[PDB]
Amino acid sequence: YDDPPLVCCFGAVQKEFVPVVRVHDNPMHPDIYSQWKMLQWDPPEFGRAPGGPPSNVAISHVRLGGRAAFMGKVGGDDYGEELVLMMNKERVQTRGVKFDEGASTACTRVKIKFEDGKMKAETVKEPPEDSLLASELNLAVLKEARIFHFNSEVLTSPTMESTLFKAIQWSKKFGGLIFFDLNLPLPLWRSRNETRKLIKKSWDEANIIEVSQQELEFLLDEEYYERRRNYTPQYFAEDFEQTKNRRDYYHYTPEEIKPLWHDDLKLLVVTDGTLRLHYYTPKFDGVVVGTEDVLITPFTCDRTGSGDAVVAGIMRKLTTCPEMFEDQDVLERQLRFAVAAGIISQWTIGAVRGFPTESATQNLKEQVYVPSMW
Amino acid sequence: FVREDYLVRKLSAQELQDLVKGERKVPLIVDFYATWCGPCILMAQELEMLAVEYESNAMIVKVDTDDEYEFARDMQVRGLPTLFFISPDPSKDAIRTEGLIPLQMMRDIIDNDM
Amino acid sequence: AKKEPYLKSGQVLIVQRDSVVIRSAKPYLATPGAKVHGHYREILYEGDT
C-alpha cells in the first residue's frame, strides 16, 4: 500500500452547494450582488467556515499532500462526466465512482402539492448522487482507506443511509476509521430532538466527529448557550479579563459533552470557524487558538470551502501522525496546520478554486505562529 | 427612460404559490438564494444571463431563504444554490437541481424537460 | 504574596472578607515642570489633553 495512507470520502459530488442554511438578520440588497461580499467579511456565525460536499474534502485533502478516493454515483450525462473530470484533474481516485446511464446528474424529480394551504414538494425520483446501492460499492477502496469520511446529507436519503451503514461495516471490518463531518443541511435544523434521533446511529458509528459551534449548541441546547453568552454582571466583573468585553470563546466542559460522547469516539473537534478549535478526547480536552483575516483581501475573500479545508487538514495530519490521538501537545501542533489551511481557503472565490497546497499551508502556519508553537 | 439592471424578480412564498397555481404557458424557474451565501453571487449572474437568453420563453424568479425559510424547507431545499424547474403542464413533475450547474445544463433542462 | 497573582492598576473600591473590588485606573508619569490640564476629579474624555 502506497503512502500517504488513503482516505475515502462518501456521499454526493456537487459544485459548491453549501448545505448549512439558517436565517440571518442582516440581508443585503436582493439584486445588487456586488454588496453581498460585505456578508463574507461580516458573516452569519453558522457560515463562518462553511463546509460542503465530501468531494470538496477529497480535493482539499489531495491538494494538502494526501491521497483520497471518492465513493459515490453520478449520471451518465454531461454534468456527471464534468464532475468526474474535475475530481480526476485534482488527482482524486475515481475508481469508486459508479455511473448511471439512465439518470440525470444532480437532478431530482419532485411533485408540487398544496397541503393545508401551503405549497410543498415531495421527491418522486432521487438523484443519482443519492442512489448508490450497497452492491455498487468499491471493496478495494474500502479495504485500503484508513479514514472513512461522510456527511449528514446522506441521512436525508434512505438509499444512501443503508449504503452508508453497509460501507461503515465494511470499513470497520478492514480497520478503517470513521470520520463524521456533520454539516447539517437545511431540513436537519428544524428541531433538536428529531435531528438527534436521526443522527444517533451514525454518531455512535463514528471514531472522529467534527461539528461547528452552532451545530453542537443546537444539538445540546441553543437557548441555554445563547443566554450564557448574553449574560452581563450587574455591578462588577469577576476578573479583569471579563471587563474587556471580548468575543466569547467559551470552551465546553466534557461534562456538557457527555450526552454526545460514546465509547468508540477517539476525537471530537468543535470549530468556531478558524478562530477556535475545541478538541475532546477520552483522556483530555482543550482548545487551539486560531485567527482569520478576510479583510486583507476584501475583493477576493470567500468563506466557502473553509470547513472542508479544516477537515482535510485534520485528516491529513491524522493519517501521518498517529500520536495525535494520545498526545495533547502534538494534537495542538498538528491542528494549527488545519487552522492555517482553513485561513488560506477563505482568500479565494470558490471552494475548489481556493484550496491551499501543503507548502502554502505550512508557510502560513510558520508565519502566523511563533516558532515555539510549530 | 432608464432600463432596469436586473430581470430576475424576487417573489414571496404567497406570490410564488399564486404563480404556480395559476395557468402557465412558459416554464417557470425558481431560484432559492441567500445574500450571505458565496456561491449565490455566481448563480445570480448566471440566472441573469439565462433571463436575458429566454426573453419571454421562460420565467425566472428568486426566493430569499432569509424571508421564506419555512417555505424553502417545505419544498425540500437542502442547501444553496437550489433551482426548481416547474413545467407549465401540471401533469408533469418539477426538477430540483442542487449546486452551481452550468448554463448549458439549465438550457438543456428547459428545452428537453419543460 | 508569593502564591498570589499580581495586583493590577486601580483604586481599592470595595473591601470584603477574602476579596477586593478594584476600579481600574491608568497612571501617567510626569516630570517636574509638566502642566496638568484639569482640576482634581475632572472628567476627561478620550483624546483630551
Next chain:
Amino acid sequence: RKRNNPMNPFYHGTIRMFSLLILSSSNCFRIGTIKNSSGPLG
C-alpha cells in the same frame, strides 16, 4: 399649562455624581444563656 393643550387608555451601571460617570463591570473587577448571634437588642 395642561389646560392650554388644544395615548387613549381605552384603546447596567451605577451612577457616580459630584457631572456623571457610570461604574459597571467594564471598569470595576474583583481580585481574590444561648449562643451569641448578631441581631437586634430591642
